[PDB]
Amino acid sequence: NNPLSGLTHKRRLSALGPGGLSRERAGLEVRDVHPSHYGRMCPIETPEGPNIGLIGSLSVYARVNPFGFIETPYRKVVDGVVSDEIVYLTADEEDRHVVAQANSPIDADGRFVEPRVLVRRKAGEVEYVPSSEVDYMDVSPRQMVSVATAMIPFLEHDDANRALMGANMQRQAVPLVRSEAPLVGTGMELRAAIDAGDVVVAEESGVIEEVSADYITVMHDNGTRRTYRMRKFARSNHGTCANQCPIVDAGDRVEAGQVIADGPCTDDGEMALGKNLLVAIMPWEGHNYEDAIILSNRLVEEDVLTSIHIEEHEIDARDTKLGAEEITRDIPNISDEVLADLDERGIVRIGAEVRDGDILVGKVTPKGETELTPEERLLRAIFGEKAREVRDTSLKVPHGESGKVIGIRVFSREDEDELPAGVNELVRVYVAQKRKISDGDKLAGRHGNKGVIGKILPVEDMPFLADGTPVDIILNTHGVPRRMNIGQILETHLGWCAHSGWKVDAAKGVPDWAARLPDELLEAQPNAIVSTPVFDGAQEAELQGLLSCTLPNRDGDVLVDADGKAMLFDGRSGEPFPYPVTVGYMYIMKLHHLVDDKIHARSTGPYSMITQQPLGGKAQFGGQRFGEMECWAMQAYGAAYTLQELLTIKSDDTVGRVKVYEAIVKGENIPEPGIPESFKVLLKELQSLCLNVEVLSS
C-alpha cells in the first residue's frame, strides 16, 4: 500500500513455516534479541502482535553469503590506522575480533584521540579498551538498523518500543493524491524510493523526445529511443492508488539512473508517506484527550489528507444443469431509475456513480422450480405479471461503499480466452471513491505517536499565531513525556526551522555551536528541506542555535522565541492564551485503518449450518461475538433476562428469532425465549458418542 511496505515485505526474515517453529512452539528465549543481531537483523523492526520477535527485517548493509549464513561489512583498523578496505564478516567471525564504535572521533589519520573506545567484545560485551589492539570498526552508523527504521528522524532520542511502533506504522501509510515530500527526514528516503521499483528510472541517458501523462518517449544518445508506458490508477493489493506522475519536461536531459516519474508516495523520487502539518502541542478542551488528535477543516477543504481507494468486484456466469446464466438486462421485477446507468450489454456504464445496494452486472440464472405460492398466483392475476421463470442473483454493491466506476474487464469463452473449465463469462468491475478524512481515521507520526481523529473543527476554532495562520493539527501534551517519545518534539522544532528558514550571522566568525556544523547549513531559504541521519544528526546545541536565528518569511515577525514556544491566539473566545506553547511543522501520515472499512452492524443476517449462530466477519453480514468473558460480566451484574435474551432468541432459537422479529414489527410484546438449538446439537453429538443422555422432566 506504499513503496516502503513493498520494500520491507521482501528483505524480511521469518521464522515460522516448514522447518521453522510455530508461535506456540516458540519460547521466550528465541524472541529475544541476540548480541549477534547487530548489523545483521534490525532489533527494532518487528510486529507488535503475537509474532513479536519471531519475524524481523534485514539490516541496511547486511549481505547473504553464498553459503546461507548472514554477513555484514566492516572496516578494518590496523595499529590505529583506519583503512578504506571493506571486508565482510559473519556472526562467528566477529567474536575472534574487536569491532569499534560506528561514530568514533576519527582524525582522518586513523587514530582515535582517546585510547579508550566503545567496542563490542567477543561475547557481545561492551567495554573500554586502548586503541592499538582494536582491529575492526563499523562501516557507518545506522548499520544495525533496517530501512523502515532508518527513515525515523531523531531515532536515538526515542524509546525502543515507540520506535518499534513508529517503524511498523510507516509500513501502513496510505498514498495520498499529492504526496508532498517531508521537510525533515533522512537520506534513506531517496534510496528507498528509488530501489522500491515503482518509480520510473531512465535506464539509458539521453534527451526526452516527448512527455505525456500516459507515456514518456526518451531519445537516447545512440539514435534509438525508448518509451516508458506510465501506469495510471492501478489497484494495489490492498485497494489503494498507484498513479505515476511524470516530473520531467519535453526538452530536458536525463542521465541514466535519474528518477523519471514518481510513484504513489514519492515526491521528486524520494519517499513521501505523509504531509507537513503545523502542530501545536497544547491539550485543547478535551477533544485531544487520551491520544486523540484534532484537525482543522483546511485539511478537508484543501484535500491535504485524502486518498483514492479502488475496489474490484468479480462475478462469473457459469454452465449449470439448469442451462446457462446470462449477463443480460432481462432482470426481473426491477424499476427504471436504477436501470438508467446500465448498457444493453447488462453492466454499469463507465464513469457512472453507484452506492451500497445498486446493481452492478445483470446476471440471471434459471430458477428451475419451487413451490409457487397460491398467493403468487393471485398476485399475478391482479396485475398480469409473468411467471418470470428465472432467478435474479445479480451482483450488487455490498453494504457501506460507493463511488465512481473506473474500468470493466470482461472475458468469455467465445472470446477464445483461458477461462476456468465451467465458467463462460467473467466480468470484473473497478469502483473507486475519493475517500476524504473524517472522524475515526487513524493519523500518526513516525515517532510512535498515534491516535484517531477526535474531531474536525472549523478554521475559526483553531489557535492561531500573531501572523494569523491557524494551526492544522493539535495533539495532546500528556502523552509525549510519559510514553518517552521526545524525539518528535525535536523533529517539530527542526521542521519549524526548516520551514521558516534561517541564517547564522557569520559576521564576527562562526558561533561556538556552529563550529562543527557543516558549511552551507548556516543559510537556509524558506521551505528548505533538511536531512538527519538516525544516529548522527542535529544535536541539542545545534538545534537550539538554529532556533535562535529563524528569520521571518514576509513580515517582520519572529513568531517563536529562542526556546521554541510561541504565543498563539484562541479562536474560540478570542483572548490570547496565558502561556506560550510549542508550535512547528510535523510530518504526519494517514494510516490504512479508515473508519469506513471499520464500521459494521447487523439486525438479521445469515446463519451457520451446523449451529444456527450467525456468521462472523465483514464479507459476510457478521455479528459480534459475545464470548464467555462477557458472559462473566453479565452474570456478575446480576442481569439474567438480558443474558438469556443475548443467548437464546437473539442468537440461536430459530422459532424464537422469527417470533421476536414478528412481535417487534407488529408492535407486540416480545415472547418468552425458547431452548437454544446448539444445546440440541450438543445433545445429539453426545448421543452419537455412545453416551445415553436423556433430559428428565421429573
Binding site: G185, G187, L190, V254, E255, V259, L521, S531, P533, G537
Partner: peptide
C-alpha cells in the same frame, strides 16, 4: 548525493560513509 536527479538535501551528518548502501 551521487544520484543524478537527487534534490538538494542538506545534511547534519558529521562523518562520511566509506560505501553507499
Amino acid at each position: 548525493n551521487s544520484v543524478p536527479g537527487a534534490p538538494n538535501r542538506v545534511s547534519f551528518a558529521k562523518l562520511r560513509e566509506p560505501l553507499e548502501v
